[PDB]
Amino acid sequence: PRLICINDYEQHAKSVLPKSIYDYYRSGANDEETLADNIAAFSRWKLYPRMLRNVAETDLSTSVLGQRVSMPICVGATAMQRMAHVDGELATVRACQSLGTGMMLSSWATSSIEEVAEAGPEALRWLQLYIYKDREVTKKLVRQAEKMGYKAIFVTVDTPYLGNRLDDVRNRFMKNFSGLAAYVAKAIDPSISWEDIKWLRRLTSLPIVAKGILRGDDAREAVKHGLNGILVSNHGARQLDGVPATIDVLPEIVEAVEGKVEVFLDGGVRKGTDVLKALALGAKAVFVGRPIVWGLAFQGEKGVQDVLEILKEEFRLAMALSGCQNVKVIDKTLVRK
Amino acid sequence: PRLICINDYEQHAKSVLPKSIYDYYRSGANDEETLADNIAAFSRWKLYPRMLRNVAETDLSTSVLGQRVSMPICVGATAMQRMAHVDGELATVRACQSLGTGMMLSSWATSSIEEVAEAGPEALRWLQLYIYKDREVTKKLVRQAEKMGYKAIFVTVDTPYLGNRLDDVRNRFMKNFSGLAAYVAKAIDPSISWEDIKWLRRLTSLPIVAKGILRGDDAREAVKHGLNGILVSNHGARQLDGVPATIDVLPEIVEAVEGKVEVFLDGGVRKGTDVLKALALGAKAVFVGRPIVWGLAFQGEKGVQDVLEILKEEFRLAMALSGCQNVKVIDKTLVRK
Amino acid sequence: PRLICINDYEQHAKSVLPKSIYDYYRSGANDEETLADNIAAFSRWKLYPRMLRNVAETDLSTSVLGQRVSMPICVGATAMQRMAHVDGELATVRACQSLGTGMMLSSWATSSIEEVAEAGPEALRWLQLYIYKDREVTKKLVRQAEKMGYKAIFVTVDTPYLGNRLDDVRNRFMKNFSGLAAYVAKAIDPSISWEDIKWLRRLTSLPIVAKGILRGDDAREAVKHGLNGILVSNHGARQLDGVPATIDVLPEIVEAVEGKVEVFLDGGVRKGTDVLKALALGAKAVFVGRPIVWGLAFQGEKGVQDVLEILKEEFRLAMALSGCQNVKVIDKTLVRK
Amino acid sequence: PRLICINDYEQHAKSVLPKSIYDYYRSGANDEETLADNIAAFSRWKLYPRMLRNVAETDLSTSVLGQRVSMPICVGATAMQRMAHVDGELATVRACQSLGTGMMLSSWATSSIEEVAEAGPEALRWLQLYIYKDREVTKKLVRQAEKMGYKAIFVTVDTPYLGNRLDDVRNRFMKNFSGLAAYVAKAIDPSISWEDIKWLRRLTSLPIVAKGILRGDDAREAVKHGLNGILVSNHGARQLDGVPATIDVLPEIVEAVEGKVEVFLDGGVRKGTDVLKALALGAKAVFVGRPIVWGLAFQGEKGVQDVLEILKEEFRLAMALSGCQNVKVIDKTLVRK
């Protein structure tokens, strides 16, 4: 294999993973209209590069909720990574610790909070949480993440029930505690409200990011409840089909929060120019989901490291060709839809 | 067969029904531009879901012209159901009586008004009517529907002549009284005017819905003639080709009637998110045509029951993932085109 | 063969005509972008039909430059019809005389002005003219048309040179006096100006229509020079590629002439709904080019008669389903783009 | 071979050139979204031709930076032409000297400045320059071009680093001094700023054109630094992917420079109507890149001459069919997007 872009990693993963596993990772909800649009929407945003700006020394570094990272490109929560590679999340956190970027650990990981911390003691690590009907286990997760050096909580707010991913049902298809639709119907609480966010905000002094916000009014409510960021996300197009692409709703959310918290994006990031467009529209950083899994499927830690390095170099080139020597000068005039 | 969405039922029906019968049911008029657009138009309307609203107890119930139904998803008139299954309309009305929803019986049914009432005595049942050149038979139908417990009349107003469905002519292709184009040219009155609506309004005290309205001015005229609802319909794209999708004209019609009557939609409903979008734009309920026929072709009553249950569950999930605990809170901010 | 729409006639013509002849008739200029758009543009204009208007007695009749015709659907000039059938233009004029519509005779016909008049003595007949470098032959044509009972002159104004139709060059591919590109470079005058229109206007008292106008300013100039109509035409997309579809420029031209002359359309008419849309946007009538040739290729006079009857019946149905009992009530609210 | 349009030359070049060489010449950056759009964008601009203007004597001549040319169609810089044909740039400059148009010589030519001048002593010739980390060699190039009769400098400003063309990396793929990405990383200066433009402006009294401007603000800065033209260019879509098509950004640049300098376009010119549209939107002339290489691949000098003659004749026809007797009357009302 000669894999030189993120799409090559997906094509390789399709060739080596059982169909059920590949389809678990690549599927979106229902007719997958949002899955296609998360990528198509990036192509509609055009770049207006500045020339002659001196880009000899391109600095990709930024910060996420106060913590320095090497690039505005971080690993999003994807469940059950050991299905892709025997090391799963441990390989992922080692690759993040090599790159100098952060890993968001899924609540449905095939590795424990304490195992991951130990594989990546110097890695920037966050916990993605669901509020479970069992609030005792929810609180136990939060208190384990605090003790194991995790630096934030990403609370997923778009999953009262699991989305309907047809291939998991059509294909006859967790170390911390569709079969997956039935699992959620059991553990995950569909009653969660803003009252539960008030509880979580009182539970921990860790930064909390609301993950899965698509509306400006909900983003303002998150700010009002004392949360510290918004991850503009449609859950990799796996929840409600027919929502907009995240790059299309990002500007409304950035406008609505009036600078009070950091805004992040995930969904459809596959190229350095996607990262650049997201930052031009006001995201502080982006998270990648599927590309990391294809990295694992190729060669575990090394495969994840290669995916993250291809993204980093593509982003560096896009910054340089656009006239941007650092992330602080990536401005809204770089893009038009 | 493992049929888990409405498209699967169509694919199965194509596999088991003679081509002429399948094409009778699936065909639209002329080049079928509206047939494609009835579905494509739903995909252009995007959903803006609210998070954290408490959707543990999702209530799908609503009412149609005063009568309670279990969900805002009802069976539209499709002629000649016994071509799809030996029980035809009797299977359909039994499935509606199990689901707690309504059946609109076609005037060109392969079962009699009195036979259907008897198969579904507790089912909510309406009659779709044409005004026939023979007004005596027209009046006999209305007076049979009143005596047999039907709760409304859906008068079809878009069919002075039958549309030109090419496959019926190219394929060498009624218990109440193209060969079908020639049948209409004989029975159906092309002279029908608003004067005939005044006659029908005086004929019966049953609610009357005008079916096949596409213009706001015609919707206002229906209100002025004392009708009790508008079914925004292009007749499943089988009459005039090149009219807009019904989801696209729905907002104009809702605006034009100023709340005075209920507005319904049919045409292209195949998914729970289609139902949600129609309700967000002000429809009280939607009617499904073809999906019921594919249910019959699969397994008669059980097949219709399965189609209606897939629609119900998809709608429940779309409501929950959008933050809607009941139909009364499905609002216009949920959608944008 | 079972040919029930105009597209079927084209498919049959492709099956029976030598490739060079078929490609001569079906080709557009260069990459054929306008050829595709002449048809695609009709599909973008949507119909908003009125219900319940009494369409029992649909009257398709209208008039063209004062002369009654049975329908607003007339035969446009297409050169060299005997390549499609041994009777060529004589078959075409007999079919027009049966239908009660008009024939525009090409200046590059394979039959003489006096032969056509004689085959269709009761047919409504017009002459399409080019202003030839030889003004004596130009004047001889006009004076023959006047003597043989032709009722107008359609002067083609978009052809100073012939368009570049690639297949005629790639395929190694006139009774009144690319090899065809070379013929024009010889006979047709590229110097023609509005001064030449003044000459033609003084030459004959016959109505004169300017054929091939695409701009409102040129349409106003035609009115100022005392011409009696505008045929909005891109020459069947065979001249300048990348001009708009004729249905898209029709409203600008109708607006610009302020009712002073009749406006006609050709280019991409294949269905009754195309005729209806053109009339809703203010055309008095439309001309069909290629469909007549496919009629000839099928069965000469009978094939042309069948094409014209399919168009007539499709138009009658579209009028009836739109609520229009006659052409005088086809209004601009029937369409929206 | 029977090659009658520019696309035919590309298809022939694909048939005769090794895949690595063909892909070097035809590739764009990353997913090649801009490569497709450079051509698609021309098709969206529609032509509104004037009739009856007298186009018997069509004059294509114009001037570029003061020098007369036979047509507003000139040869752009494409590196390493000897890979396409044994004569490379010498064949190209001979074909330009036959046509009476200009050649822009690449800084990465497979022929020397003094060899090309000698093959085309009477040809209009310009030098495309990069500002190299080695300013001594940069100055040597400029002073050779001045001594050898070159009439301008086109300074490329969009290439601080080379774009990522995937096929050069996936295919295991200079007489004046991806392996090519690595070459640039060595010679080409990523620090170049407007200070370096001030240096180049003081270095030579030759006209200087800034090549690769996409923003109006950068075009105004070029005017302020005393440059004499802007070549609106995305480097044949080979640098930053996802920038707009050059025909789409051309009007902003023409507006921004307020007539102070000539504006040129390259990127996606393949047809005479492309040239016409560019001139209608205010370009003085256009440059062709790839089409010249396909000319070489076919038959060296004769192949380049044939490509340039097909462009000239297509442009002459498009001018004539649009009503334009010379370039001075090609106005903005000819086009609408």
Ligand SMILES: Cc1cc2nc3c(=O)[nH]c(=O)nc-3n(C[C@H](O)[C@H](O)[C@H](O)COP(=O)(O)O)c2cc1C
């Ligand atoms: C296979 C898979 C598993 C996921 N598991 C989780 C999860 O456990 N928790 C969560 O909050 N999001 C989960 N997501 C959503 C991701 O965090 C993220 O929103 C999404 O992958 C981003 O889009 P992308 O895959 O296009 O980069 C998952 C996504 C995928 C594809």
Ligand SMILES: Cc1cc2nc3c(=O)[nH]c(=O)nc-3n(C[C@H](O)[C@H](O)[C@H](O)COP(=O)(O)O)c2cc1C
């Ligand atoms: C096979 C078939 C038969 C139909 N028969 C009738 C009919 O008898 N009366 C009527 O008013 N509408 C009739 N319709 C129109 C339907 O009531 C309804 O408007 C349409 O099916 C809704 O679109 P859908 O099939 O996309 O759900 C028929 C539609 C189909 C597909």
Ligand SMILES: Cc1cc2nc3c(=O)[nH]c(=O)nc-3n(C[C@H](O)[C@H](O)[C@H](O)COP(=O)(O)O)c2cc1C
């Ligand atoms: C084969 C062919 C020959 C034509 N010959 C002539 C001609 O002799 N004179 C003329 O004015 N227009 C000519 N035209 C243009 C037609 O009059 C008319 O504008 C065009 O066919 C209308 O478009 P349609 O073919 O899509 O119906 C010709 C078109 C075709 C396809």
Ligand SMILES: Cc1cc2nc3c(=O)[nH]c(=O)nc-3n(C[C@H](O)[C@H](O)[C@H](O)COP(=O)(O)O)c2cc1C
């Ligand atoms: C094979 C190839 C080599 C090129 N080499 C150079 C170069 O050496 N210097 C430069 O400034 N531009 C270079 N360009 C960009 C061209 O000057 C020009 O901007 C582009 O080819 C125009 O687009 P077109 O190929 O669609 O006509 C190159 C383009 C191609 C395709």
Ligand SMILES: CN[C@H]1C(=O)NC(=O)N(Cc2ccccc2)[C@@H]1N
């Ligand atoms: C369905 N994929 C995930 C997702 O998108 N969000 C989430 O919470 N997951 C946990 C999970 C769900 C089903 C089965 C096992 C684990 C996902 N894997």
Ligand SMILES: CN[C@H]1C(=O)NC(=O)N(Cc2ccccc2)[C@@H]1N
């Ligand atoms: C043509 N399909 C129907 C329709 O769309 N509307 C209607 O009234 N029908 C009655 C019917 C028509 C033809 C032949 C038999 C019955 C339809 N089946």
Ligand SMILES: CN[C@H]1C(=O)NC(=O)N(Cc2ccccc2)[C@@H]1N
């Ligand atoms: C090229 N087709 C025609 C057309 O569009 N307009 C016209 O005047 N024609 C005369 C003609 C042209 C070439 C060869 C023979 C005759 C056409 N046939």
Ligand SMILES: CN[C@H]1C(=O)NC(=O)N(Cc2ccccc2)[C@@H]1N
């Ligand atoms: C990459 N193609 C070129 C281009 O677009 N711009 C440029 O300066 N080139 C010089 C060059 C680059 C790589 C290898 C050899 C020579 C190109 N050939």
